[PDB]
Amino acid sequence: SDKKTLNDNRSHHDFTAGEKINYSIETVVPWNIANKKVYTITDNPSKGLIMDADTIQIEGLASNKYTVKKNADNGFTITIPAANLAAFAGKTLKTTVKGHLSIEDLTLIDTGIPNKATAKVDNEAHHEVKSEEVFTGGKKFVKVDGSNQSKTLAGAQFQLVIVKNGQVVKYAHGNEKDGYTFDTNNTNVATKTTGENGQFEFAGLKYSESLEAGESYAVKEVKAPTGYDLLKDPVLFTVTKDSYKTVQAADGQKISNTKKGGFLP
Ligand code: NA
Ligand code: NA
Question: Does the keyword Transmembrane helix feature in the UniProt annotation (predicted)?
Fold first, then answer.
C-alpha cells in the first residue's frame, strides 16, 4: 500500500531551519489505470514544513508527463493524465521530493512535524500517508550584570556562531523563518539585540549532537550594553530536545557582563 518515508538514517530527526529534508512517496497505480482519467498526488505538510516543489522527481516518468502546482498550505499537487501511467498499471510509483522547516510560530519549536500525502484515482482517494516527524530546537538567553545577576541589560547585540578548536569557525546567516546558513563570511551575521528585560534567543537550530565533530554553538557579543565592557570571548551553549520550549524566556541561560569606565565627550 502507499507510504511516505523520511529518508534520514539517524535515531534523532532534528534539523535546522532551511536544511533540506529528503522524502520518498510511494503510491500504488491500479491495474485499470488506463481506463481512468487522472491520477493525483497531494502533499499536505504539517505547519512548519515547506515542500520544495522544484525538487519533485518521479522514477520512470519525465517532467513533461505531469503537472506540479504549489498550494497555499506550502505543499503541492501532482496531476498525471491516466494514459501517461499505462506502463505502471499494478505497480508502485515512486516520487522523491525535498522539504525544509520554516518557523513562523515559535510554539512549533520542540514539536514533531510530519509530512502527509494522499493519492487519488479519478475521485477515489487512497488513505492519507504520513512520514516520521522532524523536530527543530532552540536556546534562550538573558544578558545580566555579572556581580548582580538579577539586573537585566538592554542594548547588547549577539551573533550566532560555531566554535571549534578554540576559534570561531562559522557565522550564521538568516533566521528561523527564512532559514539559516553557516559559513566563513563574517558579514550579515544573524544577530539579536536585547531590550530592558535582557532577553534574546535563537530558535530553529538542530541539536548540538548533530553538529560536526568538535563543533559547538556559541553566541558572540558584538555590542555591549551601556556602561559595560564588550565580552572578549564567545559564550558556548547546547541545544537538546526540549531546551527551548521548557523554559520561559526570563529563565534563559544567563550571560554575565562587567562594568566599564566611560569616556569624556
Ligand atoms: Na508516488
Ligand atoms: Na517530517
Answer: yes
- Distance from C-alpha of 152 to C-alpha of 157, rounded to nearest angstrom: 14
Question: What is the CATH superfamily name and number for domain 138-257?
Answer: Immunoglobulins (2.60.40.10)
3-state secondary structure of 199: strand
Resolution (angstroms) equals 1.2
Expressed in angstroms and rounded, the spacing between residue 56 Cα and the centre of ligand 2 is 16
Distance 136 CA to ligand 1 centre (A): 27
The arrangement of secondary structure in 3-130, i.e. its CATH architecture, is Sandwich (2.60)
Q: What residue has cell string 501517461?
A: 84
Query: What is the helix (H) or strand (E) element at residue 218, kind and residue range?
Result: strand 216-223
Cell numbers 532559514 correspond to what residue?
179
Are residues 22 and 115 in contact, defined by beta-carbon separation less than 8 angstroms?
no
Q: Please report, for the chain, the start and end positions of each structural domain, with discontinuous segments joined by +.
A: 3-130, 138-257
How far is ligand 2, taken at its centre, from the CA of residue 75, in Å?
12
